[PDB]
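Submission sheet (multi-component)
Chains listed below:
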Amino acid sequence: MTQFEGFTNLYQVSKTLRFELIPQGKTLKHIQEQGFIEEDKARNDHYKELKPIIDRIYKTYADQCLQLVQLDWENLSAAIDSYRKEKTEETRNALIEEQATYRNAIHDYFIGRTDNLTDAINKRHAEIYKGLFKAELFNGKVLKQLGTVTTTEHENALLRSFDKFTTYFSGFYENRKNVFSAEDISTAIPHRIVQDNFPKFKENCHIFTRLITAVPSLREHFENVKKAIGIFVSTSIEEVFSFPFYNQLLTQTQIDLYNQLLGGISREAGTEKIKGLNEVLNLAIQKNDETAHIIASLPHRFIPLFKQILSDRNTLSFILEEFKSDEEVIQSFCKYKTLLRNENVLETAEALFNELNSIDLTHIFISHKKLETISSALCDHWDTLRNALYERRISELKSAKEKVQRSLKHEDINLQEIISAAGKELSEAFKQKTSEILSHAHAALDQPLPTTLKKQEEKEILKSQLDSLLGLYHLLDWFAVDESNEVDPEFSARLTGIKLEMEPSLSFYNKARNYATKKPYSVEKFKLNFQMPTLASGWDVNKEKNNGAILFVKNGLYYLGIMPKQKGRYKALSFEPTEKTSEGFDKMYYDYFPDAAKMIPKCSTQLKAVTAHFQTHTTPILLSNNFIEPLEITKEIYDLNNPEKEPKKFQTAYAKKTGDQKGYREALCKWIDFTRDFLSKYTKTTSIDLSSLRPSSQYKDLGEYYAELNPLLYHISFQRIAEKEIMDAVETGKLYLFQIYNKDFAKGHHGKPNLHTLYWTGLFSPENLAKTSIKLNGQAELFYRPKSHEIIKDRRFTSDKFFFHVPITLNYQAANSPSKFNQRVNAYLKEHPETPIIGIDRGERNLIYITVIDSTGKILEQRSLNTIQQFDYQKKLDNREKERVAARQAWSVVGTIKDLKQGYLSQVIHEIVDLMIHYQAVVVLENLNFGFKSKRTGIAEKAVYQQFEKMLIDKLNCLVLKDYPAEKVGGVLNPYQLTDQFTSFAKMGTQSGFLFYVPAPYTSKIDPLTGFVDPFVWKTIKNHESRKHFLEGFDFLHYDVKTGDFILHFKMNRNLSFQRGLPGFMPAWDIVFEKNETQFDAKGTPFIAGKRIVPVIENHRFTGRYRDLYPANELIALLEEKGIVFRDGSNILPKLLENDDSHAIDTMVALIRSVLQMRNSNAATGEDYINSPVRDLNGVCFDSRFQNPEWPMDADANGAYHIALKGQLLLNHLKESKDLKLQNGISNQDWLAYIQELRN
RNA sequence: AAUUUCUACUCUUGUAGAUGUGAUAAGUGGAAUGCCAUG
DNA sequence: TCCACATGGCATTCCACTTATCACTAAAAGATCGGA
DNA sequence: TCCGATCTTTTAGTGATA
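Outcome: structure written.
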């Protein structure tokens, strides 16, 4: 018996708030005269310049370390193959433990505990490894022991510039700590070595082995192209794709040579490219041979390896040098232009072209690789000139035509034979386009260069000159200048004499593009330190001398106080907590023991003195300092904390590995009494009440006890401080005072406050002071950003500002992570079966469509959110897309989409949470592959497929309603928690709390009245005999005389090869070819019923736009075309199947394909709908154009509805199950069987 | 037509909703340019 | 499979864009600096 | 030239069933 309001305070969530600090008094003067802002700007610049040096040291240690790795890989290969062949759970855990073993084996080289290495280099690697995460990378001691990087004196001075400020690199350290770590982290060296690169190498090895086994005649070829690449010269082409060579494939250079072996060296522009592995695979594919088909059947693509983590990328391919500045590019192109007019190239080209217009053209030839380009630029189609020449060679003569077309691809043609093959329209089009191009070039040379390159117009005119010159170069590359044919030697020589100086314009074009499309520089905020090695890392009153960041509250306003260092020392300035009635600021007092799991052993067991006492003698030791009463450290407690093994005996890892529940329980009990009397005895924690703690033997584990213990030691009090002391503190410069500010703290604000402002007010409301549910955290950052009725546009960028970023944590009383959250949600859904279901369909046309269904599948509300607050976000986002791709092609600025997508997604998120709190329903969302959504966003990033999922998860993880009371469930004190804690999409399961991930196939293309899908696939129906065979499988066809319709009967025990093999429930189908007459909707608008939209096929494997069709009209036109009598209602199929002409059979398969076509779309006028081919058993032929609200209006509403009944299946399967866990998805066959059972 | 920041309006120098920051690393996808074969 | 309408394999720039980790700290301990 | 204050650094380690 649980409630909907019980889903609160499940787990901690961490957020960050941003504010603007307004200076108070003359403190803005005090930071200005002291010169801190420029000092932090130079410090950030120094850090940015020092980062390449320090990870140069990191890369040096890496490539010195993992070069010595030599391991077997057969166990991991067998584990991967076993898990891939049989996808069971225990095989998965075997794969994880093998991957962890190999990760530890790789990491031991960094650690220095590697078995195969001898002891001296082991201790050298260990003591060098001890220095990458301390101050040892700046004193040069690591540089002395590790290989001689030998940073120059400039970088030595740069390292001296960070003297006594190594804690600024502290966040860097935990960054690089993930590089050298083995706990399965995606930003680690051994995770990439084991889990990422090794399966790819195994795949390459296996596909190479089966490709050699299938066809070995290509075996020599790869060795040959290996001699083309000239790398791995001491290795065999079989040995490279063997497992042990992977012991070489760790350094960046070796994987670079592997990827370049797969790709091939690319030389400079103009010359050919050295072919590689995938190149020759594609070339063998494109032969249209039987060998091409068999290599097409197996996979025919080698996969490149991922880059190493911290290393840098090189190549053997040609790299084009980049233009350093805009002045250099405009100056160099001005000299290029002047040297080009000095060579009088334009009149030279005019001379050549009036020569080709006035001499015979049998002695001038055209290269065979440009016939398609000339055909596409000249005529409307690229296949015009090739087919014209092919038919002309036929007419001047089956097999002979094939050798003719084999000769056409590689033999160069003289241009008169093309003129005689084509028409004179080709000649005049050629002459006018040459006129157009040389007039463009003339305008290019006549027009002067722009003065600068800072704005768009100069960029676009320079682009215009460049592609005019380049198009002249392309037009120059049409002719076959080689003396292999009978080209005129003088004209060939002068065409080289123009083309060799037309060649560098292409490289100039690429250089200008590489300089031109750079992102324009923008002013960026940077971190302030205020000459302090640790700024605002904590709020504690002991560290308030060191961190120097405290807060004041003044009659509802909030202030940040910073204590600067006086004369380079820590001036311990304090205040007097006067009585409450005195006017003044209210200082917050912070009492925080950070985390007992790391403070307790550090402050009591992991000291130097206790260890020095305990190695030499075993007697227990009293500890006196920082204690009211000295605490006793016994032998067994230190053995529990330091057991010289990974499983600590109070940790449940020891209980899981061993099974001694009694000893683990007693060890846990003793450890809990030890931490109890330590918290009693310690100076900081002796004033904290600990009475809510249960007896020690009643505690299940360490994590639960820590979760209950943690929010007792977090405390905030408030003490009134005299105002005059604070004003003398700021006026003397001893205190930097700032005011936290946003939009809602202005005096003119009278509406509802922001959600972040609600969190900030809930932080300091006395209810949260009584019981801390939300918590102020440490590590608060300060940033400075330089500058970039009456209404001011972009007023916030007019002046330089100070910004404050502060982390908070909501649901602090709850545990850090939830336990069995999905079990709780399954329990609540099992106790509440009547809950609604919200189908969300994300699309590319209308984007987001919602449908609401009840427990019985009745529609409650359906909506397409193209227009929210009467604003068409879809159309605006589409035109933003159109101008983004237009600006990309025009070398303009590219902008961003994230802001507008975030605004529209915020509107739709508020809508769906409004309906969520109104209906207490669950949402259902289609499971989509990452590759599919990535390709969909690639063809059109108008779709929000992957972006909206993150916003839904983030909003449903921590949910606060602004209109709700604070103390009520859903307010800022008890926020709603309806989804699992977000970890990563890889470990995101099929169900995250109230959200479900349902399979994507077969949701849109389904009749909701009968559950009908198309059981055929039309790709298998290609030949005429296949069409006749499939026409044999139908039962019979009858012409209705009342309504003029056609009824075709079908049983799925026929046409099995032409069926897709998806057996539905209902064993009969009656396809209805309804008469194409005009019906009316609920609005009464006329519309012709049963019409279809079919793409217009141009020729074989060629399709254009789409055209409407009315299947009964052309069908009866077919029957009166052949003279078939059908008004008697006889069996039409045996009457028509005897006619063996292919045109007839093609017509009826076209009509039955069109009536079996479900999704009927027309984007030109924009009608999207479906028209069910099978009549409902109550005699209804469904069209969604009827606009009846009980059924979906359009096809995407239909898809969202079917996703909703898929979720209905999911919760029915939840109800009948007793394990309180969902099934691992559903299959298509069970889904369509279930919906056919429900419908009919 | 204003905002910690973003989106949408202008009745109030504002309104409605959203807003995990910093650091690091990798990957994806576009556009242009070439080399090579295909309809 | 869900989506379709000039291409496939690569190579080099440039751009946005996504995902995946880390902390979300006070005290212990060492380095340093001013005193006799 | 060696001690006592003090400022900077780094450090500590949990979660799953009777």
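Remark: Chain A is about 45% helix and 10% strand.
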